[PDB]
Each structure stands twice: as structure tokens, then as C-alpha cells.
Ligand binder design. Structure first.
Ligand code: ADP
Ligand code: MG
Ligand code: MG
Lengths: 229, 463, 462, 229
């Protein structure tokens, strides 16, 4: 059961899931995620990259590192078998100097998501209303303008559709200069399933699917944080 | 559990009544008698053998009768004792008027009150409330105005002062009331419980709620019950603290944080509730919703003798996401029978300022009888070629003769004669206002409820 | 210059007759009943005398200089009357008659203005219900025979809604200095009238129902409206605030809908307050007519009910007005009599236990405090009070404070509250039957202060 | 006089200025524009590029071509002489088939303006109010969301400042993730000057400064349209 991930994390006194764990858990509910494998050697990294398909993304996986970018932990758009291999050593060595005593669970090998319309799908717990789903457009639209919609879970199709249509940046989904319309049904589906996650899993304090990239067909969660209670 | 005997008791006890007519308990006892409660009333006083012609008892448990409801207005430090006696007597509902609990920081006293009431199988309304009224039972258990106009609106208030004031204001605004409930601190019984009762209550057609906040863990229940209620009866919420600073002020008044502004709004949407930003909008909407069915379609007609009123109406409808389209040719041809050729038929239908009183009868009648018309807002600008009361009476006649029920709101502009005519209409249970914008706003509320209800239906679709 | 329009020595009425249902006849009747002290000349071809006044068949026959001619003849007779008035040297033609550009007869309208101008004669209208000027005891409309006296000038591009609102002013206790129906605005328009009302010491507030202005008139409108705004507040009821509404307005006026967005911006640059509704327009006009503008941001809300306080706070917040802690001096003063569980966060909640005299004491303390700039008093009727008692307390406090700070009142309750509110408004104290409307009104005062400041800045020498 | 530019265009029955003409006229009003050179030969294209300094931009200058990008008319971010030569012949041939009868006046060589915060500054004539200045944020903010503020000219400093603060996307100017705050004074000054251009030059029907790039100090007009009446 996917709940084994939540149970394990709690048994080891962790307040959050690691990146790969969060994505496994997300995936098991039917929310599409970046294809991922946890590498335990630079050699596994090349193998998994060949499985997943180039280009790949390499991230360090560790409780001690929560900002991968500031510690040299993330290498993006690695196109070949050994672009990743040098990158592997750059991460692994970079981490020692900036935080030398960090636990390495491994280095996460990831699908390089192409560009699209970035989304945020949030889940929080409101004292009055319990698990509440949050939606908004990525980048400055949520972070700066706070253009966001809420629905209390469980979400009906009506709730999912209406909350998408609600945001001020909604037109970014229906086509504009240099960008085709994106799969709104796919977004609605992710919203509903996110609502289900909150309702069912009481030990999840909050969840943030950010960024989530929508394409003309389908969506893919690129990063996901899950906080436990 | 079930609030049937709360709203329709066989026996009410009043604890805190005395020979002093200024005491709250005395005020409540007076209201109960003057409003005409026909069940048993038992004044409860330590010494009085008799209050207001009724045999007084020193304890509720002494009453040789099953007391359904106990109205308690004794000081806070005496409440728990009274609760114990009521508990002994087998009282099912404790209406604790008395203030001085959580709102003043006395959380433990309040929770203890509820704990004590519950150990007897007794429910609590309040504390810190001005009481409750139920017109179908001729029951006025408040120290508010002794009377209200009879009708189908149930008004629930978390605010004591504004609540009891608005109770009087319903009379001025001609709002027919089935029930007033002061829920105050909501230590036990709250909006959800009352919504459950009013759902089932055939005397209640509309619910208006002044709401500052609901308890942690009550929201999901609130949405489930309210949405179901919304399928059959419109719910209007006057949300207090819809701004951050406002939320702070509300927290001061109630003694507990109300909650997320944004999430409350969303919950209201999911529940199909109409959120009013002001007393006036709430009352205007309640009137229309209480006196009209919801429109069965979007063919809304604006009929006006003044272009300016039409434009004000058009603008206001647009701000509420309601847009007018060309009226049916049949109706146009009908109106062309009497209006001048320079009349405008784009919707609003401008029958010109030359229009005498009977044109209002004829135009309203034609519109309402037309099978391709769903709703009508009638606008009138007073001129010397008309009389306000004549126009109003023409409208009344048209409504009657059409012999159907389509939603109608009226907006009349003018001097004291218009004020009297508007008063006259509202007393006919015809939603009338002294401005075109308010009339259209009222009509917009009918449409808003229609859309809200459709929202809920959709969200409840199987699969 | 419009001095002789608003204060004529002689007015002719063209279209009056023995038939009292005629528009011209209604106007003559109003002119006499309202008490015009100049000469009135009914003009009828056959009548020898109307309403005790010697009638003439032509304006040119009058043995006197007629300043103003009110013309209510059929449209196909108007130009003829214009030439005769022109011959007589009439300075102003008040063309009541409709049936011009609003029905698509643009050419007739332009001819009217051309002919009038070739005589040095200005035109008001056509297609109007007239005009009124209280300082001259002049009621040249076929509207209500009377208005309450005051300092408000109301201009309306709308005939029907305009003449109705003229009546509505009485109901809402708004003192009026002037009514002007400008209708089609073929010649004299808002800019001309704003120039007069600028210079008019009888007028302190200007309210305009406005659907549109003529092409090439906008910049001068901004220049004049802005200068006016330095001293007198202007409220505009913009008709056509939406595309569909603008479309309805174009139908009503016979003139194209201009850009909503540019109109709003022009209003901002002019220091004008745009009302979205009649009620807001009248509520704001009341407050602005009876109060000075606030000298600072220390607004006090004083309420006997927290709920009313919250409604007020939310409404103030929606208008970008935020409350901060009251002066400590004021807190201590009010603590002398309120219970210990009274809230002093602003709104100052003196609890529902407050009897009538607490309102007098609190209002007085607030208004006297040098760190209080404005006061909104909220009242919820309960049995411990009488509404009229609270009202008299507020009045007494205002008198006794003997300063002038903005004050608005919000009273909620039954028929006794309605009477108390009526009473206050009749004392020229802005009172409303809801907390939100009182706060909306107070917000108008602050909005005008900001508008005035916008214009001041915008006129600064660089 | 700068008015000679308007007169010349009028004498040649043109209803618009070319890019370089528009920029000269705008610059003469104190509105900063891109350093520009009109190349009449590929040798000048290379020469001028070395004059201004790589990276550069090459655009077609022709009355018959008014959407330069849409006809294969614009080559952006040219890093070296070789990129530029490829670009020059790429333009000429692109323009030749898609707009074959166009008189080519030359090729405009431009500094590739670095990235920044994009702005739009407009001037139109409203029937009621005459010359009116329009401001808004570039990209989807004006083009998709229609988020713009207006002031009737001439603009006071108060008008310029308040209309900037007015737009919903204003916060894009006061600093956000990956972008410092930009020169608000520069923008205000440009707005006022655009208003002056409208007020003084009756023969200018409208003007479109789009995009205008705002930097931490100063702004630069990247493209400019001027329509004549
Ligand atoms: N000099 C320049 N520096 C940087 N970017 C530029 C430059 N000129 C144009 N661009 C960018 O490339 C695009 C080229 O199109 P542009 O010159 O605006 O005209 P057109 O609309 O005809 O394509 C611009 O919209 C802008 O995004
Ligand atoms: Mg009309
Ligand atoms: Mg209180």
C-alpha cells in the first residue's frame, strides 16, 4: 500500500516525504508525475536515464537539503549518457562542501519536463472546513498576485471546473500568443484526486504540487511536497 | 437532536422574571404573553407566587408539568445551578439568554455549561442571546420587539445587538417572518442544527443568516446541510468579517477567530448560498426571494417609462452577470398597439415618459402573459402625466390577471407619492424599491439563487 | 456667462394655453407657485391673458427685454419661435420640446443651434423638462412645484429619471440650489454649467447624471471640473458604465457611446466621484452637503453593537479606509462610564447596555478630542434606549462640540428608528438606516478629500 | 526639425513612419530608444553590428512590410558576424518570396536589448478627450488580460505616477522572483513625453511603443509605430 510511505516516514520521525516518495504517493492516486528513478550509484543514474529517456534531471535526495539549488544539488537538461555522469559527480561533490554531513538517500533521476503552462495545485487543512484544495497559475500569478481559487473537499466535477474558471489568469489555459490551449479536463481530474488525497489521508498536513505543467494533452507534476501531522 | 419541541413546545419556563418589569426575564415573559403563546407558561421566581397572572414556581423542577424549554436570564454565576434543576426536571432545551461567557473570555464556564446540559440530554441555545421567536407557534421568547409581520422568512443572527435591531427592521422593510433565532455564542446548537429544522419546516421558505463564524470541524457539515437546503429554499448569508480587519473586529465581538475569508466564500458557493455584503442587499434580496418563484429562463424583460432608469437597470444587471436580449416579437407587436413609434424595444422596453397609468397595466400584463417571457422588472419615473398609486395598482391588476406566477420586481423614482406607492406594493407582497438599481439587484438575486441551485445540483450529479 | 439664465429679469413661456394639461401651462403654473419675482410673459397667439398675466402672441411683441424664453411648441414650430426670440434679442432659449437628435432628426437640431447663435442666443436642450434655480425663486420646469432649499446643484442628461429624481430629493431631504435638464446638450452643456456653479456662492455641491459629452469637449471638461473640484465636490452618476448599458444609453440619447475607460480616467483627473447608483449618489451628496472634509485619517466608529461595528469596518475596508486605535485620551474618557468589557479597538463598542446619554457623552468626547478627525455613530435599537433620545444626544453633542468634523449616523431598528433618522436628516445630520450606508457616506467624504488632493498635486507648478 | 519626418512621410503619401523614423522622432522627445543603424548593404550590416556591439538584431525596413516577424523579417540575438550574415540573406530572401514587390529601404541593425520588464506605452485620440496616453505591462498582461490604465494628455507627474500604480500588474515593476525593481521615474517621464507628442503633433493619429523594456535604471523603447493622419 502507498500508505506504507506515510507510515515509514512517521516511524522514522520525519515531518515530510522526500521528493521521490511524494511523487510515488501522488502517482498512486492517478495524478501524473515526472517519470522517476532513485539512483544509488552514478552507474544506476545512467541506466535509469536510458530507461526514462533523455534529457534527464538530476537532484540530490536528502532530509538535510531542502534547497537543492543553493547547495549545487540540481542539474537540469542532461542530454546524454555522460552529461549525467559528470553532473552526478558535480552534485555529489558539491553537496559535501556546502553541507558535508548530509545523509544521501541517493540522487534522483528525473524526466525533463518540457515547457508549457505552469500550474499550482495545493491542499491545506482549514480549521472550519477541513481539507481544502487550492488552484492557481504558476510563477508570479500565485506567488506575487495571489490569484488563487479554493474548494472544500471532496471536489465534484462542478467544483473543479468552476474553480479553474474562477482564477484571473484563466485565459492562460485557453490559448494565447505562442501557446495552444491546455488539457482542462486533465487539470480538473488532478484537482479532484488531490481533494481525495486530503480527505482520505488524515496524516497529511498539506500538499503542494508545484510546479505542475499543463500541455495540450495531459499534465505532469514536476515537483511535489507533502507535509505530515 | 430534533428541534421540533424547541420551536413548538407544550411548556416554556421563564427563569429570571419578576415584579420588576425592566428585568430581561420580565421583558421576555411579557412578549410571550402579548404575542399569544397558547401552550403553558411557567414563570420561575424565588419568591413570587404569581407573575403577570400566571402561577410562579421557585424551581422548574417544581412545575407539575413536562417543561420542554427553559428560558434562562439569571446572572452567569447562577446559570449552572438552574441547568441542574432543569436537568432534574427533564428539560430538553435550555435557552441561555445570559451573557458573560466565552465572549468575555470565560471559555471554561461556557464549555462547562454545555457539558452539564449534555449530561442531562439537554441542548443549549446560546449563551449570550436575545432569545428566539417562532410565528407558527405564536411564540415570542425574546426581549425584542413584541411583534413581527407574519411570513416565510427565518432570520438567524450570531449578533445580539444587530440581530435584535434587524428584528425590528423587518417590520419597516415589510418582511414576513416565520422565525427569529438569536444563536449568539453557539456553544452547542448552531446554524447547521437550525438549517436542519428549517429544511423540514413548511412554514419557512427563506433563510437569512447573519454569520460571523462557525466552529472548527463544523464546516463540512455546514456545506452538506446548506447545499441540500439550497435545493428547495434559498439561503442568504450576511457575512460579517469578510475583510481581514473586519474579521478582527468580529473576533473581538465573538471571542473566537471566525476563519478564512476566501474559504468561507468558496464554501458558500458550494452550498449555493447568496452572500450579502450589506444589510440592505440582504433585505432587498430576501424580499424578492420570499415573494417570487425563481425564473424558469433567461428571458428577463425590463419595462420602463424612462430611459435613464433603463440604463441604470441595464448597468446594474450587467454587474451581476445578467444580460438582456431582444424581447419576443409577439410582445413587441402587443406593445406597439399603444406606444408611440419612437418607443425603444431593445430591452429595456422604453414606453416613453409620455406613458399614462394604464400603459403600465397593459404592458405588464402583455409581458407576464407572454410564454417567451420568464421574468419582469418594472421601472417607473414619476411624471405629472401619471400617478404613482395608479401605476402601482395597474401592476397589481396585471399580476393578478396574468393568472400565472413569474418573478417581478418594481423600481419607482419620485417624491412622497412614490414612497407611499412603493410601501403599498411591498404590502401586497410585491417586491418594490425606491430605485431602479435596487429593483434590478433584487431581480438579480432571484437569478443568482437559480444559478446557485444549479451549481449544487451539478455538484451532486451521480458519478 | 449664465447669470441672466439663472437670474433673469424676464421670462417668456411659449406654449402655455387655457388648457392646463399643456406642458407650457404646467411650467407657467410652477413659475408662479414657486414665486418668481421677475416678469413672466405667457406667449399664446389667441389667449389675451393667462393666469392673471397679460399674454402676447410673439416674444417680439413684449414691451420688455426677455432674458429667457421657455419654448414648448411642436418641433416643426420651434425654429420659427427661435427666429422671433432672436429678433427680440432673447439671450437664452430653453427648448423643452423633444423630437430632435434623440429621434434621429440631427439636422433640425443643428439648424436650431445655428439660428439661435446667429442672434447671439444660447440654447439649453432641446428635449428637456426645464430648469430650476432656488436663489431666484425660479421653477421653470413641469416637474414638482417645490424642492427643499439648500446648496446642491443637480444636472441631468436624463429627462424622465431627472424629473423623477427632482422629486426624490424631497424624500431624501437633500437641499437643492438648482435643477438643470440639459437633455440633448445641442449647445449649452455640463462644462458651461460647471463654470456657473463654480462661481455660484449658493451652490456647494454638484451632482450630475451623465450619459455622454460631445466630441471635442472632454479636455475643457477636465480643466473646468478639476478647478471646481478644488472647492466644491462633484458627483457623477455615470450612465453606461458597461458596454450593454452604454448601448442602452446610446439608444436613449441618439448619440454614440464613448470609451467607458477614458471617462473613468477623466473623472479621476477631474477629482470627480463616480457613483454606480442613485442611492449612493444621494447618500454621498447628503454627507458632502452637510459636512466639511476630514482633516486627517483618525476616523472613530462609535457603536452600541459589535455586529454593526463589523459591518461598518468591512464597508470602510471595501473603500480602502482602515481604522486604527483611538486616541488614548478618548479611551480613558469613555472608560468613565462604559462597562469594563467595552471594546476600544475601533469601532469603540460601548455595549448594548448603553442608555441614550452614553451616546451624547461618547459623541461629545470623540468630537472634542484633538486627535479625532471624523465620527461615524452606529445605533442598534434595544429597549434600554429610545432612537429619538439617541438622536437628540448626537445633535446635542454636535452642537456642544461646537467644531465641525465630519459625522455620519447609522441607526437600525423599527419605525421609531425611521423617525429618528428622518429627524436627524432634517437637522442636516447625515443619517441612514444601515451601518453600511453611513460608512459608505463617510467614505465619500474621505474620497472627496483624496480627489481634491489628486487635483491639487496634478496642478502643481513644475 | 523633427517635424520634417512627419512632413516627408506626408509628402510621400505614407500613413506611417518606418521603425527608424519613428525612433528618431521619439528619441528627439527624450524617450530612450535602441541604438540604430540603417544598413544598405550586407557589409554595413556586419560593420554596424561591430559598431554597436554583439549581440545584435536585424530587421527589414520597408513601407510594404508592417509585420516584420510575420514575413520572416526579424532575426534576433545575433552573437557573431556569421550569425548576422546568415540572418541578412535570410531576411532578404524571406522578404522576397512572402512580400515580393516590397521596396526595401534597408536593414535596421539594432542592439539586442537585454531581458527585463516589458511595457506598453500608447497614444490614441479619443473623440471626447483628444490625445490619451495608455500604459500597461507587456506580453499577456495587455494582449490577453487587457490590463491598462489611461490618462488624458497632457499628463501631470501625478497622472503618470497614479496610472502606473493603477494597473493590476503593477507589482511586476517593484521587484519579484528573479527580477529587481525597475525605474519608475523613467516610466513616468516617458508617459508624460508621450502625452506631449500627442498634444503637440496633430498629424500623429496614434503611437505604439511596444515593447518598452524597463531596467533598474532607465528604460528602452525596442519597437515603435507612428500612424499619420
Ligand atoms: N532591438 C531588440 N532588442 C531585443 N529584442 C528585440 C529587439 N527588437 C525586437 N525584439 C524582440 O523581438 C520581437 C521582434 O518583433 P518586432 O520588432 O516588435 O516587430 P514585429 O511585430 O513586426 O515582429 C519584438 O516583439 C521583441 O520581443
Ligand atoms: Mg425618454
Ligand atoms: Mg457588544
Amino acid at each position: 500500500s502507498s500508505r506504507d510511505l506515510l507510515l515509514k516516514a512517521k516511524e522514522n520521525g520525519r515531518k515530510s516525504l522526500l521528493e521521490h516518495e511524494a511523487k510515488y504517493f501522488i502517482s498512486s492516486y492517478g495524478i501524473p508525475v515526472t517519470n522517476i528513478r532513485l539512483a544509488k550509484s552514478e552507474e544506476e543514474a545512467v541506466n535509469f536515464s536510458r530507461e526514462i529517456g533523455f534529457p534527464v534531471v538530476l537532484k540530490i535526495v536528502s532530509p538535510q537539503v531542502v534547497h537543492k539549488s543553493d547547495v549545487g544539488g540540481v542539474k537540469v537538461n542532461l542530454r546524454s549518457e555522460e552529461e549525467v555522469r559528470k553532473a552526478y559527480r558535480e552534485i555529489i561533490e558539491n553537496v559535501k562542501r556546502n553541507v558535508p554531513n548530509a545523509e544521501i538517500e541517493g540522487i534522483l533521476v528525473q524526466e525533463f519536463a518540457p515547457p508549457g503552462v505552469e500550474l499550482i495545485i495545493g491542499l491545506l487543512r482549514d480549521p472550519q472546513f477541513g481539507p481544502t484544495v487550492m488552484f492557481g497559475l504558476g510563477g508570479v500569478f500565485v506567488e506575487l498576485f495571489r490569484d488563487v481559487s479554493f474548494r472544500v473537499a471532496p471536489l465534484s466535477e462542478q467544483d473543479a471546473e468552476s474553480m479553474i474558471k474562477e482564477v484571473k489568469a484563466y485565459k492562460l489555459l485557453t490559448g494565447f500568443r505562442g501557446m495552444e490551449p491546455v488539457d482542462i479536463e486533465a487539470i480538473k481530474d488532478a484537482l479532484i484526486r488531490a481533494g481525495r488525497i486530503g480527505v482520505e489521508n488524515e496524516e497529511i498536513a498539506e500538499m503542494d504540487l508545484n510546479p505542475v505543467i499543463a500541455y495540450p494533452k495531459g499534465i505532469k507534476v514536476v515537483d511535489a511536497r507533502i507535509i505530515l501531522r | 437532536n430534533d428541534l421540533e419541541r424547541l420551536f413548538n413546545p407544550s411548556a416554556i419556563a421563564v427563569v429570571g422574571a419578576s415584579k420588576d418589569p425592566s428585568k430581561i426575564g420580565s421583558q421576555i415573559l411579557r412578549n410571550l404573553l402579548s404575542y399569544g403563546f397558547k401552550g403553558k407558561v411557567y414563570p420561575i421566581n424565588p419568591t413570587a407566587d404569581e407573575l403577570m397572572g400566571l402561577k410562579c414556581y421557585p424551581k422548574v423542577s417544581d412545575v407539575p408539568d413536562k417543561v420542554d424549554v427553559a428560558v434562562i436570564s439569571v446572572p452567569s454565576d447562577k446559570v449552572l445551578g438552574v441547568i441542574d434543576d432543569c436537568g432534574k426536571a427533564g428539560v430538553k432545551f435550555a435557552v441561555v439568554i445570559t451573557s458573560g461567557f466565552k465572549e468575555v473570555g470565560n471559555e471554561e464556564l461556557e464549555e462547562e455549561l454545555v457539558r452539564r446540559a449534555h449530561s442531562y440530554g439537554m441542548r443549549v441555545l446560546g449563551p449570550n442571546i436575545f432569545g428566539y421567536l417562532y410565528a407558527p407557534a405564536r411564540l415570542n421568547a425574546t426581549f425584542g420587539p413584541k411583534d413581527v409581520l407574519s411570513g416565510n422568512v427565518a432570520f438567524i443572527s450570531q449578533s445580539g445587538a444587530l440581530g435584535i435591531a434587524l428584528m425590528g427592521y423587518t417590520v419597516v422593510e415589510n418582511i414576513g417572518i416565520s422565525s427569529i433565532v438569536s444563536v449568539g455564542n453557539k456553544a452547542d446548537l448552531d446554524d447547521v442544527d437550525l438549517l436542519d429544522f428549517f429544511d423540514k419546516d413548511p412554514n419557512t421558505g427563506v433563510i437569512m443568516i447573519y454569520l460571523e463564524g462557525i466552529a472548527p470541524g463544523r464546516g463540512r457539515m455546514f456545506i452538506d446541510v446548506a447545499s441540500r437546503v439550497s435545493l428547495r429554499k434559498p439561503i442568504i448569508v450576511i457575512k460579517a468579517g469578510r475583510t481581514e480587519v473586519g474579521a478582527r473586529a468580529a473576533a473581538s465581538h465573538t471571542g473566537s477567530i471566525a476563519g478564512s475569508v476566501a474559504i468561507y466564500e468558496s464554501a458558500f458557493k458550494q452550498s449555493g448560498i447568496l452572500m450579502a455584503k450589506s444589510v440592505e442587499d440582504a433585505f432587498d434580496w430576501t424580499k424578492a426571494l420570499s415573494w417570487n418563484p425563481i425564473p424558469e429562463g433567461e428571458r428577463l424583460i425590463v419595462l420602463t417609462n424612462g430611459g435613464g432608469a433603463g440604463v441604470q437597470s441595464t448597468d446594474t444587471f450587467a454587474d451581476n452577470g445578467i444580460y438582456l436580449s431582444k424581447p419576443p416579437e409577439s410582445l413587441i407587436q402587443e406593445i406597439k398597439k399603444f406606444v408611440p413609434p419612437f418607443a425603444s424595444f431593445a430591452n429595456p422596453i422604453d414606453i416613453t415618459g409620455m406613458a399614462p397609468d394604464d400603459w403600465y397595466y397593459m404592458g405588464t400584463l402583455a409581458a407576464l402573459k407572454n410564454p417567451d417571457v420568464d421574468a419582469l422588472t418594472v421601472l417607473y419615473c414619476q411624471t405629472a402625466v401619471t400617478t404613482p398609486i395608479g401605476v402601482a395598482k395597474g401592476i397589481v391588476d396585471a399580476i393578478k390577471e396574468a393568472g400565472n406566477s413569474k418573478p417581478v420586481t418594481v423600481g419607482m423614482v419620485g417624491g412622497p407619492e412614490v414612497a407611499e406607492a412603493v410601501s403599498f406594493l411591498n404590502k401586497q407582497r410585491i417586491a418594490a424599491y425606491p430605485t431602479p438599481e435596487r429593483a434590478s439587484s433584487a431581480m438579480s438575486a432571484l437569478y443568482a439563487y437559480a444559478r446557485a441551485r444549479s451549481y449544487v445540483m451539478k455538484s451532486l450529479a451521480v458519478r
